Amino acid sequence: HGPICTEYAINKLRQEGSEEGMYVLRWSCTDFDNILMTVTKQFKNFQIEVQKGRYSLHGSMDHFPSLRDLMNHLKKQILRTDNISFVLKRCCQPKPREISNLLVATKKAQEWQPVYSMSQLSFDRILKKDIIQGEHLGRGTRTHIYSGTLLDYEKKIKVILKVLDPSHRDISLAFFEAASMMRQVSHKHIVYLYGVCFRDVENIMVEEFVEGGPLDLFMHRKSDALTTPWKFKVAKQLASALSYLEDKDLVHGNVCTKNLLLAREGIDSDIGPFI
Amino acid sequence: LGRGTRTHIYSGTLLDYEKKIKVILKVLDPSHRDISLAFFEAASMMRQVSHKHIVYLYGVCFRDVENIMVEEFVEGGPLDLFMHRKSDALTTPWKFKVAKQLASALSYLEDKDLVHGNVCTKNLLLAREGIDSDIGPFIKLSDPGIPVSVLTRQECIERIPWIAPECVEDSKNLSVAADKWSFGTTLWEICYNGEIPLKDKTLIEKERFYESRCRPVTPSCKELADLMTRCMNYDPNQRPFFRAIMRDINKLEEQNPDIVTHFEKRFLKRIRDLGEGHFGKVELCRYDPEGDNTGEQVAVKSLKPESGGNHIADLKKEIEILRNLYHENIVKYKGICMEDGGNGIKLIMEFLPSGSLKEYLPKNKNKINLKQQLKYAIQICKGMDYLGSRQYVHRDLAARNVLVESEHQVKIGDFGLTKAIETDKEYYTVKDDRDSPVFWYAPECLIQCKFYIASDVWSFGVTLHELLTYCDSDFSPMALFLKMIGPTHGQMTVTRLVNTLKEGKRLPCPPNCPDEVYQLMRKCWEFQPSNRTTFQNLIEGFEALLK
Amino acid sequence: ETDKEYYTVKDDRDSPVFWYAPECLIQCKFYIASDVWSFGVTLHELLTYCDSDFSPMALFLKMIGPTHGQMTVTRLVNTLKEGKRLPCPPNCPDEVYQLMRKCWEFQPSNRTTFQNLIEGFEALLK
Ligand SMILES: Nc1ncnc2c1ncn2[C@@H]1O[C@H](COP(=O)(O)OP(=O)(O)O)[C@@H](O)[C@H]1O
Ligand SMILES: Nc1ncnc2c1ncn2[C@@H]1O[C@H](CO)[C@@H](O)[C@H]1O
Ligand SMILES: Nc1ncnc2c1ncn2[C@@H]1O[C@H](CO)[C@@H](O)[C@H]1O
């Protein structure tokens, strides 16, 4: 790390568990040729001199050519400190957009601060008379999906409905915070949820329908016709979608080909497919 | 703490919110999970409110399938019984300030365009007493609860006069204007010591009252009558506003120097499961209307939600057949608790901590001598003889159904299977499809559904074989019959049972059974009911055994 | 199994008791001759076109009087030991009835084989 204040790094040690063996490296706020490490209850600091690209610990007559060469060397020894002794086990690394003293607070960047929803779920209900249940489409992971059509939202719009399996109503929690977490997302590469439906005991996520279908069998069918820029753009757009997802501190544990659904074909012409 | 409108409430305590704070939890009834919607938008609507006269909800709890509203606890309790208890000590400024603060709370409610369809004394909970000193009591408004829009048509008529006739005509006509009607109803209620309004009036009479467009109730004061008529308007759009009510009451309070055998589900404190059958379930409950845990433990029988109407009628029959019974060796009946809509009924018996002989005997090996279970047999014979003299056949005479009241007395229960015989027949024929103790029945009771008073002699003999052997699982008539009939299988069992019985097979001599006891005892299972003994003869023989 | 002449049931499951041979009701013993009884019941169903009015359920019920769930198999066994069987189906030929009633002999050893049934039926074709 750079010249980050002591309180920041001390707090960082608390979050992981403050177990003996961890350590954090950051540049000394006063000296350009010295790195300081904080080890950890006790919190011991240690300084290392870096001269002419050569690395060595203060009080030690030996020297090492690389910082990694230096720090790897001390991995296999015991450290004596007054009466207490310990062995380092693991380092600490930076985190995305980690708030610290080096950052500058501005009015325009304030609007981009993430919202606080640690214990909040919001969702919109869909009246049971506003939907039409259609034919089945296949059973998912403890989930059944039928054909759907929404009315009075234009009107008579085909939608996708998903029914949680009655054998697993105990997991209606994950059901709820999965239906809720998609309310906050807003990107062209993500599905659109009109809301949730309530009747009797079962429930439905009314999601966007796309005729393109999943890319799995699509790619399975015309492999010989595929091109290289095709997969380049396919990868880059889903990578951008994942960057958007991580930009809102949200997790998607099902990043797979089965969760990649095509929108447009574009194979025949210069236009690119959409997923 | 007591059952609400399809809701159960237990004691609660929240941790790591200070810590170790007592809270109030409310559990929606599993029989009505279909109404989890109104549940949800009732739990949500209280998130937006913020006033000192309203409850505080810490949130909602999730686990398995059930859910809980964690609400604020107050030791003051509801104002209903509070006002009931010290009516003679009440004062006029007391009710003035009580009315004005709840009116201010209702104005706050209408200021946020929210509806509360349960403005009643039962939803008024006290916070501080203040009677002794100049400080005034504090009350706070509770949750709206289940909406009336889902109540039955019958359930829409018991809320009279608290319910507005507009919602009665159509539930869709609900609006904030109906809150003033409940407000005026409560105003009248607090003016007469909380007396039940429109009591001694049938449902049809209340409907006639609404349709006749007559005044529901009148006070004895001119100004009170004026203000009530001003707030008791059949036109919802003509009802004046709350701030007008506050100004009127503030004017008048200075203008007037002169001051002038049923059980409630809310008082049923369930403790622990007492007994579950194929169609019904018995719970252990404490009836504590005072809320001080000084109530009386009672045994309550209930039916599972998926029970049919035929089983409902069977249960009702159970009530009336037991109601006219009165004997020292039978379960005691006290009253009946009604559920909302008339679709549910609770049967209340006596809870005996001694339990039944099935459980009492195994834990009491050495303290019963032969004389004691001989007395028990005398008691059971007397109970059946009383029942037979009333032309009833219990049809479920089992030691598990023989409740114990003391080490000198037992009682008989589980009368859900008891049937009366008509005045011009010698037996009864069963029609209902229900599991039955086939091992406790006489051969005719297995072959032709024919049940006599001599049939209960067979059941008594089985129960005595149970009793003298101290109700041993090792010697259970279930297992004894099973082993004497070989490996049998469910539907198969009764067949081979009949086969062996026609072969002259019976239960063996119980351990250490005296020869005279065995002789009189085997007399009970003669094949022909006409050749079977009577319970008067059994009592005579047993008492001779005492001599 | 390779060294037995029948089978004994242990699992607790609802079973078509009206379709079973007397040993299948009394001792859980199920033979290949046991399926001859079931075939005869099914043929009584088939020739009568599977009539609800002539259902073996209802036919047996009415020949055994008013019975009741757990009670039914008892009286069923009683009547069967009395020599009672399902009646002649409507318009059933005399030879068809003769070969057909052969299926419900009380002793499984005295019950016919399905090869014999096929032979008799094909002779009926001729
Ligand atoms: N008054 C009572 N006191 C104590 N236990 C009771 C009482 N009434 C019923 N029970 C318990 O309920 C269980 C079942 O009761 P019973 O009415 O015999 O059968 P069912 O299961 O049909 O209700 C028994 O084990 C008995 O211990
Ligand atoms: N979220 C979805 N959007 C569009 N189509 C879907 C979705 N989930 C499943 N399908 C359709 O279901 C079928 C396979 O599950 C395919 O026709 C696929 O297009
Ligand atoms: N919301 C509530 N806050 C405080 N006490 C309550 C509440 N609901 C019920 N109770 C208590 O339950 C009992 C009667 O239901 C009384 O002791 C009453 O105080």
Alpha carbon nearest to ligand 1 atom 20, residue: B277
Nearest-by-Cβ selection for B491 from C10, C73, C75 = C73
Least Cα distance to B121 among B185, B25, B217 occurs for B185
Nearest CA in chain A to B59: A119
Residue A152 CA, ligand 2 centroid: distance in Å: 23
| B77–A contact, CB cutoff 8 A | no
Q: Which residues, 6 or more positions from A231, have their beta carbon under 8 angstroms from its beta carbon?
A: none
Smallest CA-to-CA distance from A237 within A211, A214, A260, A210 is with A260
In one letter, which amino acid is A238?
L
The dihedral over CA atoms of B441, B443, B446, B451, expressed in degrees to the nearest 10, equals -70
> From atom 2 of ligand 3, which residue's Cα is the shortest distance away?
B73
Residue B282: CB partners within 8 Å, gap ≥ 6?
A: B273, B274, B275, B276, B299, B300, B301, B302, B349
| Closest ligand 1 atom to Cα of B401 | 18
Which residue from B279, B348, B356 has its CB within 8 A of the most atoms of ligand 1, so it is best to mutate? B356
Give the rounded distance of the alpha carbon of B89 from its chain centre: 34
Q: What is the DSSP string of B416-440?
A: GG-EEPPTT-S-EE--S-----GGG
Gap between the Cα atoms of B182 and B440, Å rounded: 58
Cβ contact A201–B34 (<8 Å):
yes
Q: Kindly state the helix (H) or strand (E) to which residue B412 belongs, with its residue range.
A: strand B409-412
Give me the helices (H) in B396-485, please. 443-447, 455-468, 477-484
**Residue reference for tokens 């059952």:** B3
B510 vs B525: CA distance, rounded Å: 15
> Ligand 1 within 6 A of B277 CB?
yes
In the sheet that holds B280-287, the strands lie side by side as B262-263, B336-338, B345-349, B296-303, B280-287, B268-276
B418 neighbors B321 (Cβ within 8 angstroms): yes
DSSP 8-state assignment for residue B203: H
Residue B275 in contact with ligand 1 by CB distance below 6 A: yes
Helices (H) and strands (E) in chain B, counts: 17, 19
Identify the CA nearest to B383 among candidates B456, B441, B445, B323: B456
Distances (CA, A) of B109 to B43, B46, B173, B178, B370: 16, 11, 19, 13, 72
Element (H, E) at B103: helix B92-111
User: At residue B456, what is the residue type?
Assistant: D
Q: How far apart are the first and last CA of chain A?
A: 39
β-strands B392-393, A54-57 pairing: unpaired
Helices B370-389 & B535-546 angle (0-180, nearest 10): 150
Burial class (CB in 10 A: 0-12, 13-18, 19+), B171: middle
Question: Which alpha helices (DSSP H) does B232-303 contain, by range?
Answer: 242-255
Strands B262-263 and B336-338: parallel
Instruction: Tell me how far apart the alpha carbons of residues B215 and B232 are, in angstroms, rounded to a whole number.
Output: 8
**Phi and psi, residue C98, nearest 5°:** -60, -55
Helices (H), B308-416: 309-323, 357-360, 370-389
d(CA B30, CA A169): 13
d(CA A42, CA A18): 9
Contacts of B264 (CB under 8 A, 6+ apart): B2, B289, B337
Within 10 angstroms of residue B249's Cβ, the number of other Cβ atoms is 16
Backbone angles phi, psi at B402, to 5 degrees: -95, 95
B485 Cβ contact partners less than 8 Å away, ≥ 6 residues apart: B493, B496, B497, B499, B500
Could you tell me if B379 and B413 are in contact, meaning their C-beta atoms sit under 8 angstroms apart? no
Among positive and negative, which fits the CA dihedral C63, C65, C70, C75? Answer: negative
**Farthest-apart Cα atoms in chain C, separation:** 46
Contact assessment for residue B437 and residue B396, using Cβ atoms and an 8 Å cutoff = yes
The bridge status of strand B124-128 relative to strand B138-141 is: antiparallel
How far apart are alpha carbons B45 and B41 in whole angstroms?
A: 6
Of C115, C32, C44, the C-alpha closest to C23 is C32
Cross-chain Cβ contact B34/A173 below 8 Å: no
Residue B441: list chain C partners with CB under 8 A. none
Positive or negative, the CA dihedral A132, A137, A138, A143 is negative
- Kindly report whether the peptide bond that precedes residue B161 is cis, defined as omega within 30 degrees of 0: yes
Residues of B in contact with C25 (CB under 8 A): 492, 495
* Residue in chain B lying closest to A200 (CA): B34
Any idea what DSSP says for residue A115?
Answer: P
Element (H, E) at B35: none
Q: Please, which experimental method was used? A: cryo-EM
Which residue from B354, B339, B345, B355 is spatially nearest to B300, judged by alpha carbons?
B345
3-state SS, one letter per residue, for B350-363: CCCCCCEHHHHCCC
Across the interface, of A173, A198, A200, the residue whose CB is closest to B62 is A173
Q: Binding residue per annotation — B278?
A: yes
Structure tokens at B306: 């998926």
Residue B65: its chain A contacts at CB < 8 A? 169-170, 172
Phi and psi torsions of C43, nearest 5°: -75, -40
Take residue B352 and report the two structure tokens written for it. Answer: 């005996």
* Torsions phi, psi for A37 (to 5 deg): -120, 145
Where in the sequence numbering do the catalytic residues of B fall? 396
Q: CB-based burial of residue B514 (10 Å sphere; 0-12 exposed, 13-18 middle, 19+ buried)?
A: middle
3-state DSSP assignment of residue B174: coil
- Measured from the alpha carbon of residue B471, the closest ligand is 1
- Reported as type and span, the H/E element at residue B135 is none
State the angle between helix axes of C72-81 and C56-63 in degrees (0 to 180), rounded to the nearest 10.
80
Q: Does residue B403 line the site of ligand 1, with CB under 6 A? A: yes
Chain C residues within an 8 Å CB radius of B487: 8, 28
| Residue B225 beta carbon below 6 angstroms from any ligand 1 atom | no
Helix (H, G, I), strand (E, B) or coil at B214: coil
Question: Which residue, B240, B393, B61, is CA-closest to A119?
Answer: B61
Does ligand 3 have an atom closer than 6 angstroms to the CB of B71?
yes
CB C22 within 8 A of CB C81: yes
Residue B301 assigned ligand-binding role = yes
Contacts of A104 (CB under 8 A, 6+ apart): none
Tell me the best of B1, B7, B22, B54 to mutate to test the pocket of ligand 3, counting ligand atoms within 8 Å of each CB and taking the most: B1
- Neighbour tally for B419: CB within 10 Å: 17
Residue with tokens 């709840």, as numbered in its chain: B102
Nearest to C20 by CA among B536, A121, B491: B491
What is the number of other CB atoms lying within 10 angstroms of the CB of residue B30? Answer: 11
Q: Is B363 annotated as a binding residue?
A: no
Q: How far apart are CA C40 and CA C104, in angstroms?
A: 7
Give the residues after which the backbone of chain A is interrupted, taking a C-to-next-N distance over 2.5 angstroms as a break.
40, 153
Would the annotation count B545 as a binding residue?
no
Tokens of C117: 């049934």
If 0-12 CB within 10 Å is exposed, 13-18 middle and 19+ buried, where does residue A213 land?
exposed
Closest CA to B185 of B99, B78, B247: B99
Helix (H, G, I), strand (E, B) or coil at C93: coil
Residues of B within 8 A of A173 (CB-CB) are 62
Kindly state the tokens that stand for B415: 């009368």
Which residue in chain A has the smallest CA separation from B58?
Answer: A119
CB contact under 8 A, B498 and C74: yes
B521 Cβ closer than 6 Å to some ligand 3 atom: no
Tokens of B407: 């080490």
CB contact under 8 A, A200 and B34: yes
B139, B53 Cβ separation under 8 angstroms: yes
- C-alpha B380/C-alpha B399 separation (Å) is 10
Q: Check: CB of residue B418 under 8 Å from CB of residue B387.
A: yes
Report which ligand 2 atom has the smallest distance to the Cα of A207: 1
Contact B174, B115 (CB under 8 A): yes
Cβ neighbours for A199, distance < 8 A, ≥ 6 positions apart: A128
Q: How far is B484 from chain C (nearest CA, A)?
A: 14
Identify how many contiguous H helices and E strands chain A contains and give both numbers.
Answer: 6, 12
